[PDB]
RNA sequence: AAAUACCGGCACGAGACCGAUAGUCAACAAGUACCGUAAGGGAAAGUUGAAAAGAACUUUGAAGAGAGAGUUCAAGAGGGCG
RNA sequence: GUGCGAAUCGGUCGUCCGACCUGGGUAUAGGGGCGAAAGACUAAUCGAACCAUCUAGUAGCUGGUUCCCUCCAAAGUUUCCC
RNA sequence: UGGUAAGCAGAACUGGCGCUGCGGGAUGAACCGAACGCCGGGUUAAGGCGCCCGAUGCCGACGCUCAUCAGACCCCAGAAAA
RNA sequence: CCGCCGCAGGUGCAGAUCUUGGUGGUAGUAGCAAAUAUUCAAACGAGAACUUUGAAGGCCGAAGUGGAGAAGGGUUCCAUG
RNA sequence: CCGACUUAGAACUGGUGCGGACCAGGGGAAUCCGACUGUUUAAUUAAAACAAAGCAUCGCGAAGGCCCGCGGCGGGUGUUG
RNA sequence: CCUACUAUCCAGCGAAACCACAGCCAAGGGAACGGGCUUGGCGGAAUCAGCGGGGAAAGAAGACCCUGUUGAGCUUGACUC
RNA sequence: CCAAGCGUUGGAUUGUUCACCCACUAAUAGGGAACGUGAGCUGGGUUUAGACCGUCGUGAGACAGGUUAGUUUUACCCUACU
RNA sequence: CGGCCGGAAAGGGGGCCGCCCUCUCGCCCGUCACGCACCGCACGUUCGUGGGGAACCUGGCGCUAAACCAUUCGUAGACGAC
C-alpha cells in the first residue's frame, strides 16, 4: 500500500557513489568555454585551505534591509603561492571524445615537481627527465622539440598548461608538489601555444589568473569522516527508543517483491572524502604575500582602507592545524570544501555572471585577526600588551 | 616409512617428517605453501619474520574472514596473517631436515625445499558447554607435516 | 508306577543357522562402564607377526617427533599395528 | 535469547513482628495425594507422575517398499454399505 | 443446467490428457500434425522460409494501410458502444 | 575360491525428518566482552603477559573475595616428581 | 576538683556555596475495582482472581452428623460434645 | 557529543544451526508470485566490513479449520453399568 | 488538455484502516509494490492459558458482547544492496 | 646505393627529379631444345623468414631503474587502502 504521509527523499542520488575520492586533489571535470575573441588566460589555480575568519564590510544592494549597514561575513583564506609552469599538453578533438595529442615538458623541472613522479623519493636515484632534459641543449633535439610545437599548433585544439605548486613556500610537512593541467582559454591555438611556451619555467601568480569580487568555482575533496551509519551519512530519522536491534538505522530497506534492495535505499558506509565542486564562491580580496622592500618586511595584509593597522591575516598563534600564511592568498566568502592544509583547485566560473549579488564590489572595513585557538580577545600582539600592561615574564 | 612424492635422486636429498603435530592444519598448509620452493636459508629468515610480524603468510585457500595486511602484496594477494605456532613447528622441521643433510654429507646452504606436504591428522576431541543444557565438540585439527630438501646450486 | 511335560539347572552331542552394525544385551575386565533419588535404563569394544625377532647403536630436538641403521618373506605388518 | 543460565542478569520495584523467613526430622502416593484454588504443585514430567510389562497395542491415515530385458496393459464408472 | 461471470459448479456424445515421447504453437499436461525397437537414404504433415533459426538471396502476382498507442497468424493470452 | 546340474533363502537400495558409524561445506568463522587493574625487576627453566620472590598501584571493606563449621563430596588434604 | 555528650543563639567569612560525594518520597484533582495486611499460575497473567474478618444458611445429642477404608468389635473429626 | 565493554585487526584457541543442486535480473508461460525453463537484459579471479530486500530463509510432521467411524479432561435431562 | 518534474503538513479523540474536528498551507489529490514493509521495530486491537460483567445454557461452558493482565527467537551462509 | 621532395579520426610503405648504378635479360610473338618423364591418384599451390614462448651462436649501438614491505605521517582510517 501507499506511503501514508508523503515526505521528500533523504539525501541526493546525484552523488550516489559515496566512496573515498580516488583522487586527493580536486580534478577540474569541466573548464570554461573558450572564445577566440578573448586574450589568453589560465582558467584554474591550485591553493591550500589555511583557515577561516570573520570580515566586516558595508553591504551595497539597494532595496534590502541591510543596505548601507555593516555585516559580519565568514571567509576562508586559501594560501596560493605562485605556480611554476613546467610543461604544455595538446588535445586533438576526436569523435571518441578528446585525446591527449603530445606533452612537452620544460628543460629545468624543480625537485618539488620531480617528487610527484616518485612514491619513494628517498630510495630513488632521481633520474626522472634526465634523458628528456638533454633534448633542450643539442641542435638535433631543439629541431624535433620545435617540430612538436609546429605539429601541435596544427592538429591540437585544446591547449592545457602543466603548473605545479611551489610547496617549499608553505608551512606544510610535505614537499611533493601538486601537478595540474590548467586549460589556457584565449585567442587562436597558435597565439595560445606561443604564449604557454613563453611562460615555460615562469611563476604564474594568482592576480594573473583571478581578480577581486569574482565568483569562482572551488573544487576539492570533502573532509573525511570514515565508515558512518545511515543516520550520519544520509540524515534519516532516528527510530524509537524501544527499538530492539538498534534505533540508529533505516527500518524498511525495501518492499517484498522488487525482491532485491534498491541503489536508492540509504545504507551505512563511507561518509566524507567525496570529490565536490562548489560554484559561486566570491573572492572578497586577493592578498599580497610577505615581501621585503628597503630592508623592512611588509605584512600589512589585514590593513583595510578603514583599519590601517600593520597586522597580517595570520591570527594570534597562527592558523590552527595549518601554520603562518606568508604568501599571496585569495579570501573567499563563506566556507569551502575540505579540511585544513587540503589542496584546493580554484576555477573561473562555467556560468555567465549577471546578478546584483555577483557584480557587487566588496570594500572591507575590518578583517578579524583574533586568536582562532580559543576565545581570542585581541586582534594584534601590541594591542594585548597595551591593554594588559607588563606581565611577570617582562 | 613412505613419503607421498619421491625425490629425483635420493643421493642429493634429505627428509624430515612430523606425525600428529598440534598446530592448526589450515594455518600450517598456508605457511607450507609460502615456503614450498624457497632456499633453506631464505626459508628460515622468512619464518623468523612471520614470527616477528615483518613478512606475512598469504592465506590463499583457507581465507574465510581472514584479515587484509599490507605485507600480502609481496605475494600478489590481499589477505595475510602471521601463524606463529605454524611457522615455529615447520622451523623446528627445517632444523631437523638441516640436521639430516649434515649427517648424509650434503652441502646445507645449497638445499632447496622441493616437496612439503601438510596432511590432516586424527582429531583430538574436547567439548564446549552451550545454552539450553547442550554439549558440542571443541575438537583440535592437528596435522602430519613431511618435507624433502634437495641440493640446487 | 509307567506312558506325558520341561526356553530354569548340571552335563553333553549336533546344525543346508550367524559371522563382530550379524549372532544373545554381552565373541573382549558385560549385566561391565555410564545414567537416574529410586523402580529401572544399559553400551561401545575381536585380529602385529611363523616367531617379539617389539627397532640396539648413532644423530637433531627440552621433548613429542624425525633422519639413519637393524629385525622380518614383508613395517608397502612399528604395540587400537591383517 | 545456539545464554552465565533447559528461567539467568541489571536497574526499578513488593514486603520486612507476622496469615514472617528458614534448616533438619516426620506424615500424605497416582483417578491418589496436597491445594489462601492458578487445574496449581507431586524430582526440568501434570486437564492424571515415573518405571517395567501386556506390546511388535490398533491405524479406512502419512512415509518408504532394493536386479535387467521382453511381451500384454488399465480405472477414476455401476449397485449396495454409519 | 445453475450462476453477472469465472482457469466456477454440474451433465450428454466423442476424442484427448492422466499412462505419451516426437514436429509445430517462442514458452505450456490437453491445441495443431503425428503416436515411438536401433540405424542409412528418400518424402511429407502441421507449421514455416529478413536475422536469431534449417528454408523465398523468386528481378513472385494484384491490391490495401502511415499509427506522435501501427500492425503482425487456431486454442491464446487483452477491448466495446459511439 | 570358483564353473556346470540341481536344492535352499534373513538374496540385489538413493530415498523411509530410515538405523549405526564416518566426513564435509559453513570456518580458521561465531566466539574466547557480567562483577574497576595492573606494572617493574629478579629467580628457576629448553621456553614466561600468566609460575615464584621483592617492589609499586588497586580491589573485597568485618551482612568480606576474611576465619571456622553442618549437609553433600570422598582423598580432592600434604609433600615430591 | 573530675567532667562526657548535645542543644540553642550570635559574630565573621567564602565567586549564593554548603544533606556539595554518598545516602535519599515528584506532587495534586478525580473515576473504576478489591475494605485492609495476606495469597496466587516455579518457567509469558500479582490481578479486579483466591483468602480474610463480618454475615447468613444447613446438618448432627454419639446406636449421631461429616468422612475414610478391600477388609474388620476398622479408621479420621475426637485428648471432641 | 563524550565515556566503559564490544564489534574491528592480530597471537593462541576454536564450535553450531543449516545445506537436492545451487545462487544477477525483466517479462512470459507454468500447480494461476522462478535461482534454473523460454525470450530478452547480460555475465570477469579472490575477497573484507556491514546490512536486513529476497532465498515464499531457519526453528517445529499447523496449536486455527476440516476429516478420522483416533482419543483424552470435563458436564449432564445421553446410553449401559 | 500536454503533464507524475516537484510538493501534499502540525495536532485533539480513536488500537484503529476509516472518520471527525482544530490550525497552518501553493495544495493540504487518490493509489500500488505478498491489502510493500514483525531475523525492521512496536504489540495498542484481535487471537491461548488467569480473571470480571451482561445475555445464553440444568451444567461443563458459549458470545465479530464489553473489561483487565498476558515470553515478539536466529544471520556468522548465498544473493541483493552499501 | 647517398638526398630532394609527402603523411593525426585510430599519423606508413607512397609518389618525384639527381646519381655511385647494372643490363639491353624481364613484357608479347616465333625459333633451339633441355631440367627425377618418380611409371592414373589425397592433405599440392599462399600469406610466411606469420603469432607466441624458451634458450644456442654471434657482430655493432648502447642502457645503469623502480615498485612493494618495514619505518613515518594523520588532511586518511574497521582492516586493507589513502
What residues form DSSP beta bridges with A215? A282
What residues form DSSP beta bridges with A213? none
Burial (CB count within 10 angstroms: exposed 0-12, middle 13-18, buried 19+), residue A325: buried
Within 10 A of A330 (CB to CB), how many other CB atoms are there?
Answer: 28
Rounded Cα–Cα distance for residues A287 and A267 (Å): 44
What residues form DSSP beta bridges with A227? A270
CA angle B143, B147, B150 (to 5 degrees): 170
**DSSP 3-state of A45:** strand
Rounded Cα–Cα distance for residues B85 and B82 (Å): 9
Q: Tell me if A230 sits within 8 A of A250, measured CB to CB.
A: yes
Rounded Cα–Cα distance for residues A286 and A81 (Å): 11
Helices in A221-301 by DSSP H: which ranges? Answer: 230-233
Q: Find the helix packing angle between B84-104 and B25-34, rounded to 10°.
A: 50
Which position has the grid cell 638535433?
A140
Burial (CB count within 10 angstroms: exposed 0-12, middle 13-18, buried 19+), residue A69: exposed
Q: Find the helix packing angle between B25-34 and B40-52, rounded to 10°.
A: 130
Determine if strand D comes within 7 Å of the CB of B137: no
> B141 CB contacts (<8 Å, ≥6 apart)?
B24, B25, B26, B120, B121, B123
Rounded Cα–Cα distance for residues A200 and A151 (Å): 18
* φ, ψ dihedrals at A42, nearest 5°: -65, 145
Rounded Cα–Cα distance for residues B54 and B90 (Å): 18
Instruction: Indicate left, alpha or beta for B145 from its phi (over 0: left) and psi (-120 to 50: alpha).
Output: beta
Rounded Cα–Cα distance for residues A177 and A167 (Å): 5
> A61 CB contacts (<8 Å, ≥6 apart)?
A67, A356, A357, A360
Rounded Cα–Cα distance for residues A26 and A221 (Å): 6
Within 10 A of A165 (CB to CB), how many other CB atoms are there?
Answer: 28
> B92 CB contacts (<8 Å, ≥6 apart)?
none
Q: Tell me if A313 sits within 8 A of A366, measured CB to CB.
A: no
Determine if strand J comes within 7 Å of the CB of A178: no
Q: Tell me if A109 sits within 8 A of A129, measured CB to CB.
A: yes
Question: Nearest CA to A88 among A168, A176, A202, A166?
Answer: A202
Determine if strand H comes within 7 Å of the CB of A261: yes
Rounded Cα–Cα distance for residues B96 and B18 (Å): 10
Q: Which nucleotides of D are covered by protein (CB under 7 A)?
A: 1-6, 44
**DSSP 3-state of A373:** coil
Rg (CA), chain A: 25
Rounded Cα–Cα distance for residues A280 and A359 (Å): 12
Q: Tell me if B5 sits within 8 A of B29, measured CB to CB.
A: no
Pairing, β B143-151 against β B111-120 = antiparallel
Q: Tell me if B1 sits within 8 A of B78, measured CB to CB.
A: no
Method underlying the structure: cryo-EM
Q: Tell me if A287 sits within 8 A of A330, measured CB to CB.
A: yes
For A304-325, give the DSSP string.
Answer: -TTT-----S--TT-BTTTB--
What residues form DSSP beta bridges with B149? B14, B113
Q: Tell me if A113 sits within 8 A of A105, measured CB to CB.
A: no
Residue B17: its H or E element: strand B13-21
Q: Which nucleotide is nearest to B26 (CA to C1')?
A: F28
How many Å does it take to go from CA A8 to C1' I17? 24
Determine if strand I comes within 7 Å of the CB of A238: no
* φ, ψ dihedrals at A381, nearest 5°: -70, -45
Which position has the grid cell 591553493?
A47
Say how many residues make up chain A.
Answer: 394
Cell of A14: 546525484
Q: Which nucleotides of H are covered by protein (CB under 7 A)?
A: 1, 8-16, 24-26, 33, 35, 45-55
Strand order in the sheet with B111-120: B13-21, B143-151, B111-120
**DSSP 3-state of B74:** helix
Rounded Cα–Cα distance for residues A206 and A81 (Å): 8
Q: In chain B, which residues from 72 to 131 place their CB closer than 7 Å to nucleic acid strand C?
A: 89, 92, 95-96, 99-100, 102-104
Rounded Cα–Cα distance for residues A267 and A16 (Å): 11
Q: Which nucleotide is nearest to B133 (CA to C1')?
A: D6
Q: Tell me if A206 sits within 8 A of A286, measured CB to CB.
A: yes
Burial (CB count within 10 angstroms: exposed 0-12, middle 13-18, buried 19+), residue A130: exposed
Rounded Cα–Cα distance for residues A177 and A343 (Å): 10
Rounded Cα–Cα distance for residues A220 and B118 (Å): 53
**DSSP 3-state of A168:** helix
Where in chain A does DSSP place strands (E)?
41-42, 44-58, 70-71, 74-79, 83-94, 97-105, 158-164, 181-185, 203-204, 215-221, 227-228, 269-270, 275-286, 291-292, 297-298, 329-333, 343-348, 364-367
Determine if strand I comes within 7 Å of the CB of A257: yes
Rounded Cα–Cα distance for residues A136 and A87 (Å): 13
Rounded Cα–Cα distance for residues B141 and B87 (Å): 16
Q: Which nucleotides of I are covered by protein (CB under 7 A)?
A: 6-10, 30-37, 39-43, 72-73, 80-82
Residue A387: its H or E element: helix A381-388
Q: Tell me if B56 sits within 8 A of B145, measured CB to CB.
A: no
Rounded Cα–Cα distance for residues A320 and A326 (Å): 15
Rounded Cα–Cα distance for residues B134 and A129 (Å): 72
How many Å does it take to go from CA A259 to C1' E80? 38
> A32 CB contacts (<8 Å, ≥6 apart)?
A43, A183, A185, A347, A348, A349, A350
CA angle A97, A100, A106 (to 5 degrees): 155
Query: Torsion angle, CA of A355/A356/A359/A361, rounded to 10 degrees?
Result: -160
How many Å does it take to go from CA B119 to C1' H55? 37
Q: Is the dihedral of CA A272, A273, A274, A280 positive or negative?
A: positive
* φ, ψ dihedrals at A9, nearest 5°: -80, 130
Rounded Cα–Cα distance for residues B148 and B153 (Å): 16
Residue A241: HSE in the Cβ half-sphere, 13 Å Cα cutoff: 0
> A31 CB contacts (<8 Å, ≥6 apart)?
A43, A44, A160, A183, A185, A347
Rounded Cα–Cα distance for residues A327 and A45 (Å): 15
> A349 CB contacts (<8 Å, ≥6 apart)?
A32, A215, A216, A217, A279, A280
What residues form DSSP beta bridges with B148? B15, B115
Which position has the grid cell 527500518?
A251
**DSSP 3-state of A166:** coil
> A76 CB contacts (<8 Å, ≥6 apart)?
A49, A50, A51, A52, A331, A332, A334, A335, A336
How many Å does it take to go from CA A143 to C1' C80? 91
> A22 CB contacts (<8 Å, ≥6 apart)?
none
Helices in B1-153 by DSSP H: which ranges? Answer: 25-34, 40-52, 84-104
Residue A143: its H or E element: helix A139-152
Rounded Cα–Cα distance for residues A289 and A381 (Å): 20
Which position has the grid cell 632521481?
A126
Cell of A277: 565542486
Within 10 A of B35 (CB to CB), how many other CB atoms are there?
Answer: 22
Amino acid at each position: 500500500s501507499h506511503r501514508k504521509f508523503s515526505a521528500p527523499r533523504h539525501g541526493s542520488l546525484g552523488f550516489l557513489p559515496r566512496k573515498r575520492s580516488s583522487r586527493h586533489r580536486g580534478k577540474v571535470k569541466s573548464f570554461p568555454k573558450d572564445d577566440p575573441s578573448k586574450p589568453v588566460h589560465l582558467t584554474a589555480f591550485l591553493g591550500y585551505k589555511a583557515g577561516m575568519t570573520h570580515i566586516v564590510r558595508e553591504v551595497d544592494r539597494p532595496g534590502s534591509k541591510v543596505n548601507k549597514k555593516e555585516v559580519v561575513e565568514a571567509v576562508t583564506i586559501v594560501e596560493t603561492p605562485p605556480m611554476v609552469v613546467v610543461g604544455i599538453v595538446g588535445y586533438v578533438e576526436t569523435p571518441r571524445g578528446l585525446r591527449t595529442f603530445k606533452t612537452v615538458f620544460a628543460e629545468h623541472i624543480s625537485d618539488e615537481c620531480k617528487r610527484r613522479f616518485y612514491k619513494n623519493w628517498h630510495k630513488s636515484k632521481k633520474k626522472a627527465f634526465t634523458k628528456y632534459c638533454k633534448k633542450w641543449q643539442d641542435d638535433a633535439g631543439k629541431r624535433q622539440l620545435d617540430k612538436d610545437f609546429s605539429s601541435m599548433k596544427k592538429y591540437c585544439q585544446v591547449i592545457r598548461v602543466l603548473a605545479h605548486t611551489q610547496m617549499r613556500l608553505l608551512p606544510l610537512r610535505q614537499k611533493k608538489a601538486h601537478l595540474m593541467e590548467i586549460q589556457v582559454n584565449g585567442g587562436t591555438v597558435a597565439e595560445k601555444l606561443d604564449w604557454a611556451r613563453e611562460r615555460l619555467e615562469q611563476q604564474v601568480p594568482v592576480s594573473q589568473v583571478f581578480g577581486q569580487d569574482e565568483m569562482i568555482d572551488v573544487i576539492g575533496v570533502t573532509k573525511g569522516k570514515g565508515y558512518k551509519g545511515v543516520t550520519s551519512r544520509w540524515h534519516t530519522k532516528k527510530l524509537p527508543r524501544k527499538t530492539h536491534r538498534g534505533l540508529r538505522k533505516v527500518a524498511c530497506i525495501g518492499a517484498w517483491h522488487p525482491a532485491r534492495v534498491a541503489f536508492s535505499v540509504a545504507r551505512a558506509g563511507q561518509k566524507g572524502y567525496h570529490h565536490r565542486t562548489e560554484i559561486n564562491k566570491k573572492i572578497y580580496k586577493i592578498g599580497q604575500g610577505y615581501l621585503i622592500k628597503d630592508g623592512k618586511l611588509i605584512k600589512n595584509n589585514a590593513s583595510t582602507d578603514y583599519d590601517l593597522s600593520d597586522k597580517s591575516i595570520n591570527p594570534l598563534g597562527g592558523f590552527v592545524h595549518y601554520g603562518e600564511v606568508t604568501n599571496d592568498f585569495v579570501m573567499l566568502k563563506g566556507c569551502v570544501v575540505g579540511t585544513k592544509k587540503r589542496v584546493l583547485t580554484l576555477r573561473k566560473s562555467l556560468l555567465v555572471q549577471t546578478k546584483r549579488r555577483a557584480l557587487e564590489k566588496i570594500d572591507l572595513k575590518f578583517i578579524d585577526t583574533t586568536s582562532k585557538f580559543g576565545h581570542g580577545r585581541f586582534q594584534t600582539v601590541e594591542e594585548k600588551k597595551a591593554f594588559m600592561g607588563p606581565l611577570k615574564k617582562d | 616409512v613412505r613419503y607421498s612424492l619421491d625425490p629425483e635422486n635420493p643421493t642429493k636429498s634429505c627428509k624430515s617428517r612430523g606425525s600428529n603435530l598440534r598446530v592448526h592444519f589450515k594455518n600450517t598448509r598456508e605457511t607450507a605453501q609460502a615456503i614450498k620452493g624457497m632456499h633453506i636459508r631464505k626459508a628460515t629468515k622468512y619464518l623468523k619474520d612471520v614470527t616477528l610480524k615483518k613478512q606475512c603468510v598469504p592465506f590463499r585457500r583457507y581465507n574465510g574472514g581472514v584479515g587484509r595486511c599490507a605485507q600480502a602484496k609481496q605475494w600478489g594477494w590481499t589477505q595475510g596473517r602471521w601463524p606463529k605456532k605454524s611457522a615455529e613447528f615447520l622451523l623446528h622441521m627445517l632444523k631437523n631436515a638441516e640436521s639430516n643433510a649434515e649427517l648424509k654429507g650434503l652441502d646445507v646452504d645449497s638445499l632447496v625445499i622441493e616437496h612439503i606436504q601438510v596432511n590432516k591428522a586424527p582429531k583430538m576431541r574436547r567439548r564446549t558447554y552451550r545454552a539450553h543444557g547442550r554439549i558440542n565438540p571443541y575438537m583440535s585439527s592437528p596435522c602430519h607435516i613431511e618435507m624433502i630438501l634437495t641440493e640446487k646450486e
